[PDB]
């Protein structure tokens, strides 16, 4: 039987979100732990070799990553197992090419191209708030990152809010709160890749999460859980959202 | 997981009536073995199964599959372009047998005889849409039916080849 | 199965059929039991010994 951690991943076992030819070869690059969850990310090696076609074989992708000619949210990352998740900005300054990873209507992930001025803003979903000794508030984001603020600024934030972050230097720009009427992009569920406006809340006790009701651009009404309601704007989207 | 046979054996393979019907469908179209004929029956069969499944089926996806069924049947050239889901039932084995490439080449007059057409096909002297197909059992779409010509490098493409004029006069005669 | 013949035995058919059918008593290597084994084919038992 198994006596410790897994170090491989059979291709057939790959997550459902990856555009990968499942019957090509046996294995797949097991992602290493990182910002996002297993469900909602992909190794950048597939992004380079496959989604961009820049490298055909893997060896040349090792080399191009070693040259550090990429900027994932304003940081060169040579770790080919790095997981690139939702709302992260892939930037190639050499070609001036900027894309943002977004989920598709089918639930897979895709690179939406974006302009340069958009490239340094990133929205972080405030996953939780934890106090650290010395009374320093710490916001844990949806992408395995943390930021520190003061006690007097704790009222400003709440869990599940969105924070548009100047990622290349880690500076808070604005905070999109939650109340009725916010523009929202859905991350998971059969309502994936849906953009609409918040209508109503649904409080359920007993560990049953909160459910929002979203109206679509034309007015169709549907429902989805809290944690999938990624707020991007209060009235209109602040980013080019397919 | 195993790859299963695509055709079906007769339930009783020694009925005189069915045996003779198979024989008279064999001699005319000149197929090699009963595998081919049973296969050609089989695609008809599951077309009918699809028709029956979708006729009773409700819901939008049923409509989508129905439209795709009609569309591909038309694209095959098996049905008139204004057909409905009804007349698909009344198809016959012969209807598919005309759509065989081997039949089509004979009906284009390029061959005096069935087996001659088959031999030319397997010998790669017949091209479709600029591409050579070596399977006389290949099924031809409607849209392709006018692109069937001699293979360009083949001598039979040459009008003066010693095997062209008897074909030609047989077509004329 | 694979076995060793130990003896040739003929058998009278069942009436109203009449005739003599040859066979051999065979000890079986797999488990050791002894069982009769009919020999088919006309003029064939000569080739079993």
């Amino acid at each position: 039987a198994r006596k410790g951690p897994k170090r491989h991943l059979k291709r057939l076992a790959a997550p459902t979100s990856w555009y990968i030819e499942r019957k090509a070869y046996k294995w797949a690059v097991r992602p290493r732990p990182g910002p996002h969850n297993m469900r909602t990310s992909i190794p950048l090696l597939y992004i380079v070799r496959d989604y961009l076609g820049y490298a055909k074989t893997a060896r040349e992708a090792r080399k191009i990553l070693n040259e550090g000619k990429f900027l994932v949210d304003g940081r060169v990352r040579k770790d080919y197992k790095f997981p690139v998740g939702i709302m992260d900005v892939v930037s190639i300054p050499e070609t001036g090419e900027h894309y943002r990873v977004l989920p598709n209507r089918i639930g897979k992930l895709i690179l939406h191209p974006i302009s340069e001025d958009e490239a340094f803003i990133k929205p972080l979903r405030i996953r939780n708030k934890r106090m650290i000794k010395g009374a320093r508030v710490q916001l844990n984001f949806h992408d395995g990152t943390n930021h520190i603020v003061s006690i007097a600024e704790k009222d400003n934030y709440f869990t599940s809010y969105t924070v548009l972050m100047k990622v290349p230097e880690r500076e808070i720009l604005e905070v999109l709160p939650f109340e009725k009427g916010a523009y929202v992009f859905v991350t998971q569920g059969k309502n994936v890749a849906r953009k609409g406006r918040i209508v109503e809340i649904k409080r359920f006790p007993m560990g049953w999460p909160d459910v929002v009701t979203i109206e679509d651009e034309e007015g169709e009404l549907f429902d989805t859980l809290k944690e999938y309601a990624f707020v991007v704007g209060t009235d209109k989207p602040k980013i080019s959202l397919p | 997981k195993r790859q299963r046979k695509k055709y079906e054996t007769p339930p009783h393979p020694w009925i005189k009536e069915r045996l003779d019907r198979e024989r008279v469908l064999m001699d005319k179209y000149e197929l090699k073995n009963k595998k081919e004929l049973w296969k050609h029956e089989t695609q008809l069969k599951n077309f009918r199964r699809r028709a029956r499944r979708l006729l009773a089926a409700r819901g939008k996806q049923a409509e989508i599959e129905r439209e795709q069924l009609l569309a591909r049947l038309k694209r095959l050239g098996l049905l008139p372009e204004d057909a409905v889901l009804d007349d698909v039932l009344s198809l016959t084995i012969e209807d598919i047998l005309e759509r065989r490439l081997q039949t089509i080449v004979y009906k284009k007059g390029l061959a005096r005889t069935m087996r001659q057409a088959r031999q030319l096909i397997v010998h790669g002297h017949i091209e479709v849409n600029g591409q050579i197909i070596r399977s006389p059992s290949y099924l031809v779409l409607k849209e392709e039916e006018d692109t069937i010509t001699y293979a360009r490098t083949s001598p039979f493409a040459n009008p003066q080849h010693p095997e062209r004029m008897m074909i030609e006069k047989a077509k004329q005669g | 199965a694979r076995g060793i013949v130990l003896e040739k035995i003929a058998v009278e058919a069942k009436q109203p059929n009449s005739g003599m059918r040859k066979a051999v008593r065979v000890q079986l290597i797999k488990n050791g039991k002894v069982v009769t084994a009919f020999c088919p084919g006309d003029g064939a038992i000569k080739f079993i010994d």
């Binding site: 820049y54 060896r59 040349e60 080399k63 191009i64 000619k69 190639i92 050499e94 070609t95 | 790669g124 591409q131 050579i132 197909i133 070596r134 360009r152 490098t153 | -």
Partner: protein, 93 residues
């Protein structure tokens, strides 16, 4: 006769990837040297910095696909390319 369908430029690698079709109706499939010599002509490339990946000749077809690769410097070619493809085209003994 060679006719191109698409030429792409990997600025990250500094490389030109080109896909082309060889019409050779009634002709044997051409070698690597001849296709290289013809291809380098109209594209204005240094033949020593250009290599050909594959020339796939399909069944029952007179059009054979070909995929070729052109660098801008010797050392990127030496550092990125596997050795065996260079050996095939003769750029390494």
């Amino acid at each position: 006769e060679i006719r191109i369908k698409e030429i792409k430029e990997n600025k990250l690698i500094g490389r030109k990837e080109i896909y082309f079709e060889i019409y050779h109706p009634g002709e044997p499939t051409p070698s690597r040297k001849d296709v290289k010599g013809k291809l380098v002509a109209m594209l204005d490339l240094n033949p020593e910095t250009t290599v050909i990946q594959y020339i796939r000749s399909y069944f029952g077809s007179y059009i054979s696909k070909g995929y070729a690769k052109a660098y801008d410097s010797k050392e990127r070619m030496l550092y990125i390319e596997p050795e065996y493809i260079l050996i095939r085209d003769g750029l390494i003994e």
